[PDB]
Design a protein around this ligand. Structure first.
Ligand SMILES: Cc1cc2nc3c(=O)[nH]c(=O)nc-3n(C[C@H](O)[C@H](O)[C@H](O)COP(=O)(O)O)c2cc1C
Ligand code: SF4
Ligand code: SF4
Ligand code: SF4
Ligand code: SF4
Ligand code: SF4
Ligand code: FES
Ligand code: FES
Lengths: 131, 51, 18, 197, 109, 44, 90, 106, 262, 40, 410
């Protein structure tokens, strides 16, 4: 990033440590007015996304105690999990756009090669999708 | 600002070319207003009311 | 006749199976 | 913020930078400074308030100029890396001024008054004399690559008669033969700083 | 609710299945000018426009795509379309916030 | 078609005095140059 | 400031001004305002109900023997409490 | 005279014709020079006012001396770019003669 | 606590300090401008903003001096107007006759400023300087020569993109806003300069030549390449999109836009 | 410049917000009859 | 002061003496001694110097306060500071200490032209001796007050002669002078308040602090208080530096100090006080004008910092003015447009003039176009380029015109 800024270490390390005020950084986070906790969407996957969210929130709890696309829309209407982790193989998947997630795996396809593809490019999702 | 520059001139000086250009693109502005002119056209007075 | 070629040049499905 | 308290002993170190030449009386590669030069540049970098080291830019280039006799782009990148400043600001400085020299100079970079008062004192006969000598036309180097004529804006030695300086050495009360004699003495390997009267 | 739909000869389709879109136009950003920005206008929604099989011209079906109307006040505009019995999408005037400026703040340190 | 010689900056008009393209100044010598509409390059 | 710009006579502007005042006083049950366009064109306003009575006198002598409509223009404007804006030359 | 075409798609011929007969769609030359791809015009709407004749900064389009080209079929009226060039080829000595005889008054 | 100040005639209870320019902006009267730009930084170059003090004999840059103490300022004062013509003739003394081909031609601010204020007769009668191009990247089409040294773009780079690769170079005429050294300037906000550039000196290659400003319709909407949701003005030449531009909005993009989206 | 000399209309009364009688203009004289060719 | 630049020579000027006494730990009286002295700017500004320095009196605000001598000596015709610095660094140093105290200033940087290399060096030596005697730094020559001098080199930029441009030159930014209203009095180098002075002003200030400032006031006209160095150059018998009373007539100082005019010809002719200041016709030049700057203001002219350009008719004036404008055109950064392009413009015309190829009507437009620059550029260099030409049009018109027709025969 273009500007001067402090660099930290590793997830559970610096996160849970500052969360437990082990980090000196936790102190400056304490004296700070209207602190801001910026957690990226990319960080949440990373094998154990929930653990990171729990750690960062703790930091939010501490500050309060001391005092002084296709994403946010669905969660505005509760389409969670959102992740494809429900499976449990389910026949006849219905792509709105498999150009993105079609790169992943077609594991349901031998069980059911059929895939409706409602895209707007022949990229990725179209070739591996019937209809 | 109202009459386009003569061709010998517009091809060899900047402002000339620019006023040429804008006179033909956007055209000249007129102050807001209204009028009725009339002249002795052969059939009778010819009358323009414009705003 | 029409001049200036084409527009969208939409992509088509591959010959190969699956 | 911060500040810079005086260091009287350090000024003596700075004196060497002021007189490294001593008072008389390029494809992105390669470049590196001598240690003595690091010494000097620190000794003068001290001269500026601690908050902003960028001020050190101008003198530092001079030292490089004092070293290489010329300014390869790599040297600019080097100084830029030293003061952490972006290379582009460095280039701005390198270009904006006249004393710096992107092109190689001759072993004697002649530079001569051209502003009117010397013209009133007939600088023309001077420049015509030297041109008559070397056969050089204005800024072209001698093929020997030892001399480089340059007409120059008011040297600020206006009081005195026609004048020339060759690498920080004003010469004054010139007569067209006199300068020729001094090129001769340049070939003799020694020069004073001689007003002829 | 002075509806005048019968008086205008306009076909029902275009007082119905389309909407006006009142707004004060944004400054062209290439420009530094501000003049054209002000004063409400009453653009309609776009419909289909294909291509002429011959010569490639942008042949067009909709009766009234190019229509546009200036105004002095928004309330007048909304009321205007209401007199016409028009569906509408009023949008806020979005004047830039005033900003502090200082030539010397560039020279803090 | 062949590029005109230069050293360095020079006029172009497309050769038609108040008949060619409006006057411009190409600015190259040894380098290939220009241009407006007139192809009158100054590679030399 | 002579060769290009029109001279614009003061005199006519005077006479039209005073005459506008003249009618303004003679019959002010309805003359909202008697603006003079600076290039010598007087033009009084009228309450819409008041059309016949004004124009009537406008033919009738005092000086207002302004016979013959030149035209009956109907400028439109989408704004305003009432959009259409009728105009009578004389 | 070089044999190069004059038109440079400043496109204001489109922008000044009252009948808006003209339609232009420029795209860059491979050389990188500005050029038209489908300059076209249709005599069906053109009113022969000669505003285009005035407008062109490089004096490309020209209202030619020829006055007769009445034709059987409507589709022929709608000139393509190539057609205009062919007209420019047919008459060039003639047109250049008129402009030569006229431009001083412009 | 906020000072009274007179725009030409009427009193205005203006905010303390704040530039004369901002004062007239507050009354809505608009001073001619180039180098200044809010959401950027003030600078004293391009003195096209000169305005006359109610009493003090010499004009001062409008975006420079903050208003104070019941000042009156005659924007329309004749001496101001002679000043503006004075400057404009200088700007036009070298900008190349490129209006028909320059892709900025439809709405270049320099044209409109030339119309509203600049004297129409030319009275320069010598030779324009012109300079070689400096290639810069896949996107921007630098042409220079049409350059007028409102440094602007550098004040864009150092103060927003944060890159300071490009910068001014040289003195007097021959000074150039082009970066020294061939090196390409890539950045994520490199696209917005194509918007910011006052004239046609810097315009988008991909869109180049393809269209003209008076033509295209200008729909308003929002970006989708990001969920950031910045406001935009898409521009289409009839049945087909031509070019995208940012639409200013205080909560998000504010006059800027990304680059992948552009 | 001429277009910049354009000015908003002079206004009177704005009723919205002895004494003597007077003509809009002095009456024009009757024309002389053609002089050289009084009749046709 | 020309003899022995070492401290031994300052002894001829009496060294420091009671300078420690002058440091009463408060400017004030000496500041008043300056204000009462009636001294005005030697930078060609002419501004009330004591008033000028009084502006920094405000209780610190905590940011360190500095001082920067504008040591450059460049303008054409101007070689005043050369022999000075080459032969009397010390009084300059003492002035740095006294006036630096007058600001209470922490330090004193001094920018130089880079061309002045050898004597920037010798200056460095004498200053080193000033450290050796304990004259400076901690305590500093008694009175216990700390103060810290430095001397920056330059690099061929005459624009640096302008003060704010020089300040901007110091940080490593290019010599591009700041827009008003911030001042070195407000925000100078880095961000800290600073100030600037001509070498004359600072070198002579301690002498105001010893010998009476009213005694300074005695010389010249009261509004032209004191004395000033006067370079003499051009067609003159013995060109030289000569400090002198302000009120002195020019023919006096030439025909006395300068060895006299080379003839009665040049008396009829233009002779420029400085450079940027306009040449004046009369056979009654000096016979009218007095070298004190206000008298030149009566002649619609500045002092030009008292450099003098004698100009005989053996030389055409036009060639000189043209070469002068070339001297400007090479140098003006160009950040503000009217300068950047207008100066080059004037050069382009003057070329036609020396060619004599120009049509006469042009000259008026030139005189007109000068008006456009005459107030507008952000710093005075554009104005300084502007004036002389206006003076030339004001004067030697027939020469121009007749040159034009005589070319027109060809
Ligand atoms: C050697 C020298 C060169 C100068 N050159 C310029 C210049 O090129 N342009 C300019 O506007 N002022 C120039 N000045 C004046 C400065 O801008 C500044 O106002 C002046 O030096 C300070 O005046 P003072 O010493 O009377 O306080 C110069 C001054 C000196 C001493
Ligand atoms: S003017 Fe003639 S040449 Fe220039 S664009 Fe319009 S048509 Fe093409
Ligand atoms: S002919 Fe007359 S009308 Fe038809 S395009 Fe050319 S100019 Fe416009
Ligand atoms: S963009 Fe540059 S070139 Fe094209 S018109 Fe505006 S100013 Fe002239
Ligand atoms: S880059 Fe854009 S802004 Fe900087 S000078 Fe050239 S045109 Fe003006
Ligand atoms: S004003 Fe003109 S001359 Fe003085 S500094 Fe700014 S640019 Fe250089
Ligand atoms: S006058 Fe030319 S150098 Fe001093
Ligand atoms: S914005 Fe005021 S000087 Fe350019």
């Amino acid at each position: 990033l273009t500007y001067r800024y402090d660099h930290l270490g590793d997830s559970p390390k610096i996160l849970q440590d500052i969360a437990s005020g082990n980090h000196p950084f936790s102190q400056i986070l304490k004296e700070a007015k209207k602190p801001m906790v910026v957690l990226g969407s990319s960080a949440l996957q990373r094998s154990d996304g929930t653990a990171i969210l729990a750690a960062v929130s703790n930091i939010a709890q501490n500050i309060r105690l001391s005092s002084g696309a296709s994403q946010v829309a669905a969660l505005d209407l509760g389409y969670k999990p959102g992740v494809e982790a429900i499976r449990k193989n389910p026949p006849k998947v219905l792509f709105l756009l498999g150009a993105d997630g079609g790169c992943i795996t077609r594991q349901d396809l031998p069980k059911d090669c059929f895939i409706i593809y409602q895209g707007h490019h022949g990229d990725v999702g179209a070739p591996m999708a019937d209809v | 600002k109202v009459s386009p520059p003569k061709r010998a001139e517009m091809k060899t000086s900047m402002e000339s070319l620019i006023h040429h250009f804008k006179l033909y693109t956007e055209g000249y502005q007129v102050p807001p207003g209204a009028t009725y002119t009339a002249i002795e056209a052969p059939k009778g007075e010819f009358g323009v009311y414009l705003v | 006749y029409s001049t200036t070629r084409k527009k969208i040049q939409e992509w088509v499905p591959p010959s190969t199976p699956y | 913020x911060x500040x810079x308290x005086x260091x009287x002993x350090x000024x003596x170190x700075x004196x060497x930078x002021x007189x490294x030449x001593x008072x008389x009386x390029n494809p992105d590669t390669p470049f590196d400074f001598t240690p003595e030069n690091y010494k000097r540049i620190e000794a003068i970098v001290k001269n500026y308030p601690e908050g902003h080291k960028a001020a050190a830019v101008l003198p530092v280039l001079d030292l490089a100029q004092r070293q290489n006799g010329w300014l390869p782009i790599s040297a600019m990148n080097k100084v830029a890396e030293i003061l952490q400043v972006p290379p582009m600001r460095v280039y701005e400085v390198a270009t904006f001024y006249t004393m710096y020299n992107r092109k190689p100079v001759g072993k004697y970079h002649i530079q001569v008054c051209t502003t009117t008062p010397c013209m009133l004192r007939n600088s023309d006969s001077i420049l015509e004399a030297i041109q008559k000598k070397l056969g050089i036309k204005v800024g072209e180097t001698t093929p020997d690559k030892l001399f480089t004529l340059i007409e120059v804006e008011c040297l600020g030695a206006c009081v005195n008669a026609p004048m020339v300086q060759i690498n920080d050495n004003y010469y004054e009360d010139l007569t067209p033969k006199d300068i020729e004699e001094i090129i001769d003495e340049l070939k003799a390997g020694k020069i004073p700083k001689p007003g002829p009267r | 609710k002075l509806d005048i739909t019968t008086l205008t000869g306009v076909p029902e389709e275009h007082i119905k299945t389309r909407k006006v879109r009142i707004f004060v136009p944004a400054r062209n950003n290439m420009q530094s000018g501000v003049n054209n920005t002000k004063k409400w206008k009453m653009e309609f929604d776009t419909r289909e426009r294909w291509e002429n099989p011959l010569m490639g011209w942008s042949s067009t079906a909709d009766p009234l795509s190019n229509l546009v109307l200036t105004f002095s006040t928004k309330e007048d505009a909304v009321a205007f379309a209401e007199k016409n019995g028009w569906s509408f999408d009023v949008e806020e005037r979005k004047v830039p916030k005033p900003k502090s400026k200082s030539y010397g703040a560039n020279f803090s340190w | 078609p062949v590029s005109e010689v230069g050293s360095r900056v020079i006029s172009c008009d497309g050769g038609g005095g108040a008949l060619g393209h409006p006057r411009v100044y190409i600015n190259l010598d040894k380098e290939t140059k220009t241009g407006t509409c007139g192809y009158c390059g100054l590679q030399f | 400031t002579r060769p290009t710009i029109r001279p614009r006579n003061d005199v006519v502007h005077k006479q039209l001004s005073a005459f506008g005042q003249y009618v303004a006083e003679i019959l002010p049950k309805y003359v909202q305002q008697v603006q003079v366009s600076c290039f010598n064109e007087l033009e009084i306003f009228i309450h819409p109900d008041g059309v016949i009575p004004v124009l009537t006198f406008l033919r009738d002598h005092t000086n207002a023997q302004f016979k013959s409509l030149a035209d009956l223009t109907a400028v439109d404007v989408p704004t305003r409490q009432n959009r259409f804006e009728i105009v009578y030359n004389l | 005279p070089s044999g190069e075409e004059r038109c440079i798609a400043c496109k204001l011929c489109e922008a000044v014709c009252p009948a808006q007969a003209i339609t232009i769609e420029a795209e860059p030359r491979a050389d990188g020079s500005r050029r038209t791809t489908r300059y076209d015009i249709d005599m069906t709407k053109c009113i022969y006012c000669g505003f285009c004749q005035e407008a062109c900064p490089v004096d490309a389009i020209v209202e030619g001396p020829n006055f007769e080209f009445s034709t059987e079929t409507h589709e022929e009226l709608l000139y393509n770019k190539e057609k205009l060039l062919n007209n420019g080829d047919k008459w060039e000595a003639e047109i250049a003669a008129n402009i030569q005889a006229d431009y001083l008054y412009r | 606590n906020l000072i009274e100040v007179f725009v030409d005639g009427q009193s205005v209870m203006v905010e303390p300090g704040t530039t004369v320019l901002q004062a007239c902006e507050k009354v809505g009267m608009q001073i001619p401008r180039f180098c200044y730009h809010e959401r950027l930084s003030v600078a004293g170059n391009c003195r096209m903003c000169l305005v006359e003090i109610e009493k003090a004999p010499k004009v001062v840059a409008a975006c420079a001096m903050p208003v104070m103490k019941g000042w009156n300022i005659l924007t329309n004062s004749e001496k101001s107007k002679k000043a503006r013509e004075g400057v404009m003739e200088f700007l036009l003394a070298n900008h190349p006759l490129d209006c028909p081909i320059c892709d900025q031609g439809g709405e270049c601010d320099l044209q409109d400023q030339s119309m509203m204020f600049g004297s129409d007769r030319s009275r320069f009668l010598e030779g324009k300087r012109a300079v070689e191009d400096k290639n810069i990247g896949p996107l921007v089409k630098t042409i220079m020569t049409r350059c007028i040294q409102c440094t602007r773009c550098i004040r864009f780079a150092s103060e927003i993109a944060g890159v300071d690769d490009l910068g001014t170079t040289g003195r007097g005429n021959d000074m150039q806003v082009g970066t020294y050294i061939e090196k390409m300037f890539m950045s994520e906000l490199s696209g917005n300069i194509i918007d910011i550039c006052p004239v046609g000196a810097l315009t988008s290659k991909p869109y180049a030549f393809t269209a003209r400003p008076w033509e295209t319709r200008k729909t308003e909407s929002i970006d989708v390449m990001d969920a950031v949701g910045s406001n935009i003005v898409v521009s289409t030449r009839t049945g087909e999109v031509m070019r995208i531009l940012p639409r200013m909005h205080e909560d998000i993009n504010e006059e800027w836009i990304s680059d992948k989206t552009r | 410049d001429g277009r910049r000399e354009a000015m908003p209309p002079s206004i009177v009364m704005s009723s919205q917000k002895e004494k003597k009688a007077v003509t809009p203009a002095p009456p024009i004289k009757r024309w002389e009859l053609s002089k050289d060719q009084p009749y046709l | 002061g020309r003899h022995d630049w070492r401290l031994k020579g300052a002894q001829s000027r009496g060294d420091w003496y009671k300078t420690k006494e002058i440091l009463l730990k408060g400017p004030d009286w000496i500041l008043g001694e300056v204000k009462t002295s009636g001294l005005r700017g030697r930078g060609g500004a002419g501004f009330p110097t004591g008033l000028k320095w009084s502006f920094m009196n405000k209780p610190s605000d905590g940011r360190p306060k500095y001082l920067v001598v504008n040591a450059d000596e460049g303008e054409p015709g101007t070689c005043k500071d050369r022999e000075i610095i080459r032969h009397d660094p010390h009084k300059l140093v003492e002035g740095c200490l006294v006036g630096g105290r007058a600001m209470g200033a922490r330090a004193a940087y001094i920018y130089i032209r880079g061309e002045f290399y050898n004597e920037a060096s010798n200056l460095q030596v004498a200053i080193r001796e000033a450290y050796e005697a304990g004259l400076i730094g901690k305590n500093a020559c008694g009175s216990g007050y700390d103060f810290d001098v430095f001397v920056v080199r330059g690099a061929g930029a005459y624009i640096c002669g302008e003060e704010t441009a020089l300040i901007e030159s110091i940080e490593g930014k290019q010599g591009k002078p700041r827009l008003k209203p911030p001042f070195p009095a407000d925000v100078g180098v880095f961000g800290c308040p600073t100030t600037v002075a001509n070498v004359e002003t600072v070198a002579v200030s301690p002498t105001i602090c010893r010998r009476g400032g009213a005694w300074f006031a005695s010389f010249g006209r009261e509004r032209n208080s004191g004395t000033k160095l006067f370079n003499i150059s051009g067609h003159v018998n013995h060109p030289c530096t000569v400090e002198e009373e302000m009120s002195v007539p020019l023919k006096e100082l030439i025909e006395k100090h300068a060895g006299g005019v080379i003839g009665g010809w040049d008396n009829l002719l233009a002779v420029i006080p400085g450079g940027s200041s306009t040449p004046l016709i009369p056979k009654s030049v000096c016979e009218t004008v007095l070298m004190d700057f206000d008298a030149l203001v009566q002649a619609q002219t500045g002092l030009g910092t008292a450099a003098v350009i004698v100009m005989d008719r053996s030389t055409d004036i036009v060639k000189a003015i043209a070469r002068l404008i070339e001297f400007y055109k090479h140098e003006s950064c160009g950040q503000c447009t009217p300068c950047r392009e207008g100066v080059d413009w004037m050069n382009k015309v003057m070329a036609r003039f020396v060619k004599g190829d120009a049509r006469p009507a042009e000259i008026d437009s030139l005189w007109e176009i000068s008006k456009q620059i005459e107030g507008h550029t952000i710093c005075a260099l554009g104005d300084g380029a502007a004036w002389p030409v206006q003076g030339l049009i004001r004067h030697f018109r027939p020469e121009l015109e007749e040159r034009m027709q005589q070319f027109a025969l060809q």
